[PDB]
Amino acid sequence: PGQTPIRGIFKSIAKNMDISLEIPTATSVRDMPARLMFENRAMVNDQLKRTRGGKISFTHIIGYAMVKAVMAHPDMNNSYDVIDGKPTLIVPEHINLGLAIDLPQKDGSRALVVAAIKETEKMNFSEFLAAYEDIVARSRKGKLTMDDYQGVTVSLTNPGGIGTRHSVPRLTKGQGTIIGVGSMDYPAEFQGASEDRLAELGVGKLVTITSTYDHRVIQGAVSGEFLRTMSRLLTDDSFWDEIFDAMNVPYTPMRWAQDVPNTGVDKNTRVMQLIEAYRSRGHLIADTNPLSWVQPGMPVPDHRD
Amino acid sequence: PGQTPIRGIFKSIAKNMDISLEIPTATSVRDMPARLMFENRAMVNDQLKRTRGGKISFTHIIGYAMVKAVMAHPDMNNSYDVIDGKPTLIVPEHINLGLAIDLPQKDGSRALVVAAIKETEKMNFSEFLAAYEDIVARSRKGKLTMDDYQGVTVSLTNPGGIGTRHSVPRLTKGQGTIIGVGSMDYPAEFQGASEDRLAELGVGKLVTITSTYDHRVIQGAVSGEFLRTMSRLLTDDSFWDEIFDAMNVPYTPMRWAQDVPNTGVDKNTRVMQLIEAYRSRGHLIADTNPLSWVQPGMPVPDHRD
């Protein structure tokens, strides 16, 4: 008990939160289906354990989707400053994405600091995954420099780790938006139901994503369009084709569709026809060629079956 | 119509909301299952109508859970001040919990003021319930003093009374967090469904809880951990054992579990086996001893049946 002066990294955090009071902010909230993420992530991690690679996370996939969305809506990367006493709009050269990395101090007290993945608008998924894991690696063995903490344009936070549903976070001076990712659980009204009953109805898991922006330079219509593009990408055929291509997954990705009723030809008959198809025609998609080669002259057989 | 100067208690409220602009705040939101509260509250109120006691409310139970959570995460009870021109962290001696009590004035206009339950970290549930009902009693007959309104460390508000789903409230100078409790209804997408269909699926009621905190002294990870502990407590065996012990309820509390499917031995057979168990072995848990005495030498029979 009593009074103690604030010192060190904790004094720096306190001063920056006082400066943040001079930014007028507004937030947008949107909830998105998550089923196709769960399925297609399992297919990539199955391929990597064959080749003694690692895992990919949900933060990797949502992070990459965020970069694609900022390229589609570039107003989200702008900021405000007063230069020679006049109001000014600042348009950067690169998209530099800040991650919220929590590193414990020598004393024991936790202190969050934001490190940057730089020049993200020139990367494919493989390049992006490498750059990400570099920052996380060096942080765990204390080898980040002064340049790693400078030049952030847009930021990403993950309250969903602990299990928070959504947050309204603060925006630090220099940037235009901060994006937050909430929990990927069932809603609380379904948390005591049977797996059988949920499977019958067709109830999926959801993720809630937030956008907190500076209203002097970004308008509300732009922030809404940004969240709509992120929703579309996480259910889109072309998006999941690009990721599978980069990680060398031989199968076609699972596609987004509505549940169909068990009418006409019974679903058991349909599962028996799938077993016959693989026993007859499955050799047409098998890992038999040691080169990644298709002879351009020859015609490709149909394997939609 | 026209312009009228603000006077009295309404002028004091206006001045405090102007001072609140110098606190940088952030909010976290979490939704929690509520079924086990509804069931176990009914068992306590059944015992009290036998002994011509009163009722307990949902605000009593959530209030007590809040005190247990602040003891598990003591950073949530700290505040900020500038003392001799230096930044300072203030760690109090006690947890003093402020209730939002609305008392009408002589004119007729409603005016909310916050009264404090003091030294809450030294109380069991019985002691807590007494202290709470003291403040509410004295407020209704105009016998609160100046000392009742001074020294609040943390606060609780209930927008859910009217039926609001959640709020983003303001934080008054002197404190570090304010907790808000929303509505305990079904979601709006289920408000026109049959009781039969909802019972079949296994759909429960939920409560949404918010945390609004000063970012100069409390970080987001701490606020999320605080809401996770409150969620766990309201479904925990040990928590409900402690409340039942204090209020002298002779039965075991209802426990948290997932709905099981009607397979193998039919559920009707299981209900008939429960009727036989009580008719045979129910005397082993009956209110037959006028003392609260168990002979330590003798062995206790099994009554899990």
Side-chain angles (χ1 to χ4, degrees), chain A residues 1-101 103-105 108 110-305, chain B residues 1-101 103-105 108 110-305:
Chain A
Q3 310 186 347
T4 58
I6 302 168
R7 291 177 175 179
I9 197 171
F10 292 99
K11 192 184 184 180
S12 306
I13 291 169
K15 195 181 76 178
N16 284 32
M17 290 292 158
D18 276 304
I19 290 163
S20 71
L21 287 174
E22 80 200 355
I23 304 166
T25 55
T27 183
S28 309
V29 191
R30 186 162 188 150
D31 55 313
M32 302 174 180
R35 179 83 181 199
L36 202 75
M37 270 185 102
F38 277 82
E39 296 300 336
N40 285 352
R41 172 169 162 274
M43 286 194 78
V44 173
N45 285 352
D46 187 59
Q47 178 62 26
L48 285 168
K49 67 165 174 59
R50 268 203 281 281
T51 322
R52 269 193 307 285
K55 294 181 71 172
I56 73 173
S57 66
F58 286 117
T59 307
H60 291 145
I61 297 160
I62 295 171
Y64 188 67
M66 194 187 150
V67 173
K68 293 288 135 182
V70 173
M71 287 190 278
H73 302 279
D75 291 316
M76 296 293 283
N77 206 47
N78 296 333
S79 66
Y80 179 96
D81 204 306
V82 186
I83 286 170
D84 204 344
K86 293 200 288 296
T88 315
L89 183 62
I90 289 169
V91 177
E93 292 195 329
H94 302 295
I95 303 173
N96 301 4
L97 182 63
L99 295 179
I101 297 284
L103 64 100
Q105 296 290 336
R110 70 213 296 178
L112 192 81
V113 294
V114 178
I117 300 170
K118 302 216 181 180
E119 298 194 331
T120 321
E121 76 284 340
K122 307 195 284 184
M123 300 192 177
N124 73 14
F125 181 66
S126 187
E127 291 171 310
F128 183 77
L129 187 60
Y132 191 111
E133 290 293 304
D134 174 50
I135 294 282
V136 175
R138 289 198 286 153
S139 67
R140 286 183 298 93
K141 63 185 71 169
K143 304 203 78 65
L144 285 173
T145 181
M146 180 58 66
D147 302 338
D148 290 326
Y149 297 115
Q150 290 174 323
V152 174
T153 66
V154 71
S155 295
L156 185 60
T157 180
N158 189 18
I162 299 167
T164 312
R165 185 58 77 185
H166 75 92
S167 71
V168 182
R170 289 207 80 76
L171 189 65
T172 192
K173 186 176 181 180
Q175 292 146 230
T177 187
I178 181 166
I179 302 301
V181 185
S183 53
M184 293 177 79
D185 314 338
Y186 288 120
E189 62 260 36
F190 290 119
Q191 275 177 21
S194 185
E195 297 301 327
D196 298 356
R197 285 261 94 77
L198 284 179
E200 187 173 317
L201 181 51
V203 173
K205 307 230 226 296
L206 70 100
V207 68
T208 310
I209 294 177
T210 51
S211 178
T212 300
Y213 54 96
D214 189 359
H215 214 116
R216 296 179 285 189
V217 294
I218 296 162
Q219 287 185 30
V222 177
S223 190
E225 284 165 49
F226 173 83
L227 286 180
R228 187 167 67 182
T229 294
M230 273 205 84
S231 194
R232 289 208 186 96
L233 277 165
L234 286 169
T235 288
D236 180 55
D237 287 35
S238 315
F239 176 78
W240 283 107
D241 290 356
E242 197 180 320
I243 291 160
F244 270 38
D245 189 275
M247 300 291 285
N248 303 328
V249 167
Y251 305 114
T252 298
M254 297 279 153
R255 303 307 195 192
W256 175 259
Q258 268 205 351
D259 188 7
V260 309
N262 190 11
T263 59
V265 173
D266 183 37
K267 282 195 182 162
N268 280 298
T269 300
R270 295 178 220 177
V271 173
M272 297 280 285
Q273 286 173 335
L274 186 76
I275 293 176
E276 286 297 293
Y278 268 82
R279 278 169 170 171
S280 302
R281 271 149 174 75
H283 58 86
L284 294 178
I285 67 164
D287 181 35
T288 286
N289 202 314
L291 305 173
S292 58
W293 178 245
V294 178
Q295 182 60 228
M298 294 187 74
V300 180
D302 178 47
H303 56 65
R304 289 174 296 176
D305 74 304
Chain B
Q3 310 185 347
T4 58
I6 302 168
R7 292 183 172 178
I9 196 171
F10 293 99
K11 192 184 185 187
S12 306
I13 291 169
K15 195 183 76 176
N16 284 32
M17 290 292 158
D18 276 304
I19 290 164
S20 71
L21 287 174
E22 80 200 355
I23 304 166
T25 55
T27 183
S28 309
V29 191
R30 185 161 188 149
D31 55 313
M32 302 174 180
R35 180 82 181 199
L36 202 75
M37 270 185 102
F38 277 82
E39 297 300 336
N40 285 352
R41 172 169 162 274
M43 286 193 78
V44 173
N45 285 352
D46 187 59
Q47 178 62 26
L48 284 168
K49 67 165 174 59
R50 268 203 281 281
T51 321
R52 270 192 307 284
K55 293 180 71 173
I56 73 173
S57 66
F58 286 117
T59 308
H60 291 145
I61 297 160
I62 295 171
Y64 188 67
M66 194 186 150
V67 173
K68 293 288 135 182
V70 174
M71 287 190 278
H73 302 279
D75 291 316
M76 296 293 282
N77 206 46
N78 296 333
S79 66
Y80 179 96
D81 204 307
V82 186
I83 286 170
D84 203 345
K86 293 197 287 296
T88 315
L89 183 61
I90 289 170
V91 177
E93 292 194 329
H94 302 295
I95 303 173
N96 301 4
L97 182 63
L99 295 178
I101 297 284
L103 64 100
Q105 296 290 336
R110 70 213 297 178
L112 192 81
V113 294
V114 178
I117 300 169
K118 302 215 181 180
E119 298 194 331
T120 321
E121 76 284 340
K122 306 196 284 183
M123 300 192 177
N124 73 14
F125 181 66
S126 187
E127 291 171 310
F128 183 77
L129 187 60
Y132 191 111
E133 290 293 304
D134 174 51
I135 294 282
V136 175
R138 289 198 286 153
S139 67
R140 286 183 299 93
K141 64 185 71 168
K143 304 198 78 64
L144 284 173
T145 181
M146 180 58 66
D147 301 338
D148 290 326
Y149 297 115
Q150 290 174 322
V152 174
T153 66
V154 71
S155 295
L156 185 60
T157 180
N158 189 18
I162 299 167
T164 312
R165 185 58 77 185
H166 74 92
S167 71
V168 182
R170 289 207 81 76
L171 189 65
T172 192
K173 186 176 181 181
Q175 292 146 230
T177 187
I178 181 166
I179 302 301
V181 185
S183 53
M184 293 177 80
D185 314 338
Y186 288 120
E189 62 260 36
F190 290 119
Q191 275 177 20
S194 185
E195 297 301 327
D196 298 356
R197 285 262 93 77
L198 284 179
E200 187 173 317
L201 180 51
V203 172
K205 307 231 227 296
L206 70 100
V207 68
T208 310
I209 294 177
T210 51
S211 178
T212 300
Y213 54 95
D214 189 0
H215 213 116
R216 296 179 285 189
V217 294
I218 295 162
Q219 287 181 29
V222 177
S223 190
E225 284 165 49
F226 173 83
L227 286 179
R228 187 168 67 182
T229 294
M230 273 205 82
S231 194
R232 289 208 186 96
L233 277 165
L234 286 169
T235 288
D236 180 55
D237 287 35
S238 315
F239 176 78
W240 283 107
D241 290 356
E242 197 180 319
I243 290 160
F244 270 38
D245 189 275
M247 299 292 285
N248 303 328
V249 167
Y251 305 114
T252 297
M254 297 280 152
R255 304 306 195 192
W256 175 259
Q258 268 207 350
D259 189 7
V260 309
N262 190 11
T263 59
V265 173
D266 183 37
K267 282 195 181 163
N268 280 298
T269 300
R270 295 178 220 177
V271 173
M272 297 280 286
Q273 286 173 335
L274 186 76
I275 293 176
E276 286 297 293
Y278 268 82
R279 277 169 170 171
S280 302
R281 270 149 174 75
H283 58 86
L284 294 178
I285 67 164
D287 181 35
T288 286
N289 202 314
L291 305 173
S292 58
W293 178 245
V294 178
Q295 182 60 228
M298 294 187 74
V300 179
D302 178 47
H303 56 64
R304 289 174 296 176
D305 74 304

